[PDB]
Ligand binder design. Structure first.
Ligand SMILES: C[C@H](CCC(=O)NCCC[N+](C)(C)C[C@H](O)CS(=O)(=O)O)[C@H]1CC[C@H]2[C@@H]3[C@H](O)C[C@@H]4C[C@H](O)CC[C@]4(C)[C@H]3C[C@H](O)[C@]12C
Ligand SMILES: Nc1ncnc2c1ncn2[C@@H]1O[C@H](COP(=O)(O)OP(=O)(O)O)[C@@H](O)[C@H]1O
Ligand SMILES: [Mg+2]
Length: 265
């Protein structure tokens, strides 16, 4: 049932969810995968249709930027990703998973539910800032608004994007800095949690939500503990220009690397 499924998704973690889907059905969304496999390669916008998404609403029943993605896939992937998560559970930079098999039509379909992810992923931010198109940029306005970078009336300005006719735009982009820097830090934690847990895999941007949590272990093969290896060639390099467009390291010139402390002399 469309309500029993939602109540199961809520699970132990007490939350109130509004289904962005339609009656326990997959929600088709247009994202910015950074993909490479036998057939397709590149950093493009694909159309993902294997994730039933619910949005959490806090007290006052206001929708907030925290979702419950419920990706459903085959049983072998279910087992493999459950074991990989169990190995990587203890890290703080890993979105809290919840694995459960549910009655849908005629068989127990296994759903793995990522809890409290942001709407977009770091790949979406990188793509929006790297493939800018002034006439069609709705996934950049939404990111800039939902994280209080600007006021949603900044976009009524005639040139809210020009770097030469509106230098103040930089001050807006810099308001993402402390949201990017943290992400970087969390990667260095997640990478460590792999190196210690002996897991070999490729870190792609489209798996890290804007908070920083990493939530996909589909192609993570495991090896002898303590001898894992994260591959971050295509993560730090695609994310590279955003570290100076949004001045991500500007918090390193404050004593104790705190944005409230005074400057280092
Ligand atoms: C340089 C790096 C290897 C370093 C190493 O320490 N190897 C030790 C042994 C690895 N094992 C197979 C045992 C190269 C060669 C082996 C490669 C990965 C494997 O295909 C597993 C996995 C299969 C998926 O379908 C596709 C992605 C994965 C993550 C690949 C990524 C990357 O391209 C690896 C890590
Ligand atoms: N055709 C497919 N149908 C359903 N699931 C797939 C398919 N191809 C790959 N997958 C699984 O989905 C993962 C990629 O999905 P993705 O869009 O990244 O969701 P997530 O970001 O939650 O991992 C792969 O690691 C694999 O386990
Ligand atoms: Mg993924």
């Amino acid at each position: 049932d469309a309500q029993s499924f939602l109540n199961r998704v809520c699970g132990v973690s007490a939350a109130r969810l509004t289904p962005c889907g339609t009656g326990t059905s997959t929600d088709v969304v247009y994202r910015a995968f950074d993909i490479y496999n036998d057939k397709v390669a590149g950093f493009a916008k694909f159309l993902k249709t294997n994730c039933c998404r619910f949005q959490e609403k806090d007290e006052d029943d206001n929708l907030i930027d925290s979702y419950f993605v419920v990706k459903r896939h085959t049983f072998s992937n279910y087992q493999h990703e459950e074991t990989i998560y169990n190995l990587l559970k203890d890290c703080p930079a890993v979105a809290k998973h919840d694995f459960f098999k549910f009655r849908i039509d005629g068989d127990m379909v296994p759903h793995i539910s990522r809890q409290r992810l942001t709407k977009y992923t770091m790949a979406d931010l990188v793509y929006a800032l790297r493939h800018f198109d002034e006439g069609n940029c709705d996934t950049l306005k939404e990111i800039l608004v939902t994280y209080n970078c600007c006021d949603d009336d900044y976009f009524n300005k005639k040139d809210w994007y020009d770097f030469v006719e509106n230098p103040d735009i930089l001050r807006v982009y810099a308001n993402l800095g402390e949201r990017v820097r943290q992400a970087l830090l969390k990667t260095v934690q997640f990478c460590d949690a792999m190196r210690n847990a002996g897991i070999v895999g490729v870190l792609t941007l489209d798996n890290q939500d804007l908070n920083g949590n990493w939530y996909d272990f589909g192609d993570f093969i495991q090896t002898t503990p303590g001898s894992g290896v994260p591959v971050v060639d295509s993560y730090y390099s695609l994310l590279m220009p955003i570290l100076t467009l949004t001045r991500a390291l500007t918090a390193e010139s404050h004593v104790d690397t705190d944005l409230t402390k005074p400057y280092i002399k």
